[PDB]
Design an enzyme around this catalytic site. Structure first.
Site, mmCIF file in Angstrom:
data_model
loop_
_atom_site.group_PDB
_atom_site.id
_atom_site.type_symbol
_atom_site.label_atom_id
_atom_site.label_comp_id
_atom_site.label_asym_id
_atom_site.label_seq_id
_atom_site.Cartn_x
_atom_site.Cartn_y
_atom_site.Cartn_z
ATOM 1 C CG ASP A 1 -3.452 16.189 4.550
ATOM 2 O OD1 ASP A 1 -3.568 15.665 3.424
ATOM 3 O OD2 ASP A 1 -2.378 16.202 5.193
ATOM 4 C CB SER B 1 -5.286 5.004 -11.657
ATOM 5 O OG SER B 1 -5.649 5.446 -12.940
#
Length: 330
Positions: free
Chosen positions: A35, A199
């Site tokens: 994770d 992004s």
């Protein structure tokens, strides 16, 4: 040193991925959920409340000659999906794919929430975010990666998740055979303890690319792609009959649909998520309403590039002094 381990979907939807991990001496092999959005290595154990164990493999520290109680240490964690676990702490030898760390904090669960009990395939979590998020008190502990880092050939790990198929986590090296083209690296902020990056935009299907900054985290422990409501609405608007359902808990679409792809930007590069990756199947067995793999982050407080996005790429988690993230197509 290096390590290389195969990671395998837990079910037919790729709801999560499990990777075998050797703990203790002699080795006890547990299948852990790696994770990159948390920083605790915790396991089901001989200390876990019996009624909260249902099929998991447990770590028994009393059977390990190298286990030692970390005296006075406790831990307690709550995840974004509302799940939780807590307990005490041992140090022991932990190996992943041939890479061994001695003195790793292994957090033994005394309690786990229902979501964990109900998932017999996940024996615990191995956190790979920054150690500043580790919950051990009163002495915070380091992640497996942080402990391994100085011994690694290169201070990196890579995630290569499969679509309905196994993939690979590598430590200490970049497998140049595992991706196509070049890797595009992008800046990381560690201010919130995550692999947080920005992004450069998105496209829906064959549509034009929208240049826009989207801050979010690369999180292997989250199944879906969570993005701003504007972006998500633009995606689902291209699927006839799709709608956000408050009763279901997100966007649903007719199971008869063909889903468009979704592209996200990494610098000037582009990663394309095929439409099939965005299908999470009937909302309930036999339903003709299917659950979408792109959902709104509104009310989470952060955008999350979860497995839906990461599995479309070869992803480098560069843990050098100035960390960065790399993405390549594959």
């Amino acid at each position: 040193s290096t390590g290389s381990a195969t990671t395998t979907p837990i079910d037919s939807l790729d709801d999560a991925y499990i990777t075998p991990v050797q703990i203790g001496t002699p080795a006890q092999t547990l299948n852990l959920d790696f994770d990159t959005g948390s920083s605790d290595l915790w396991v089901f154990s001989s200390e876990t409340t019996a009624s909260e164990v249902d099929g998991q493999t447990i770590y028994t520290p009393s059977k390990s000659t190298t286990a030692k109680l970390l005296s006075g240490a406790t831990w307690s964690i709550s995840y974004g999906d509302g799940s939780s676990s807590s307990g005490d702490v041992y140090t022991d030898t932990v190996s992943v794919g041939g890479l061994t760390v001695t003195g790793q904090a292994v957090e033994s669960a005394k309690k786990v929430s229902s979501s964990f009990t109900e998932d017999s395939t996940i024996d615990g979590l191995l956190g790979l975010a920054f150690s500043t998020l580790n919950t051990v008190s009163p002495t915070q502990q380091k992640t497996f990666f942080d402990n391994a880092k100085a011994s690694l050939d290169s201070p990196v790990f890579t995630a290569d998740l499969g679509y309905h198929a196994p993939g690979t986590y590598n430590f200490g090296f970049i497998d140049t055979t595992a991706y196509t083209g070049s890797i595009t690296y992008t800046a990381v902020s560690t201010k919130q303890g995550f692999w947080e990056w920005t992004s450069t935009g998105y496209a829906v299907g064959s549509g034009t690319f929208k240049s826009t900054s989207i801050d979010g985290i690369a999180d292997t422990g989250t199944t879906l792609l969570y993005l701003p409501a504007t972006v998500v609405s633009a995606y689902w608007a291209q699927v006839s009959g799709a709608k956000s359902s408050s009763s279901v808990g997100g966007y649903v679409f007719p199971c008869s649909a063909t889903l468009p792809s979704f592209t996200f930007g990494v610098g000037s590069a582009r990663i394309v998520i095929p439409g099939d990756y965005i299908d999470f199947g009937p909302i309930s067995t036999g339903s003709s309403s299917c659950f979408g793999g792109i959902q709104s982050s509104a009310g989470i407080g952060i955008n999350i590039f979860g497995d839906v996005a990461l599995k479309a790429a070869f992803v480098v988690f560069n843990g050098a002094t100035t960390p960065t993230l790399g993405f390549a197509s594959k």
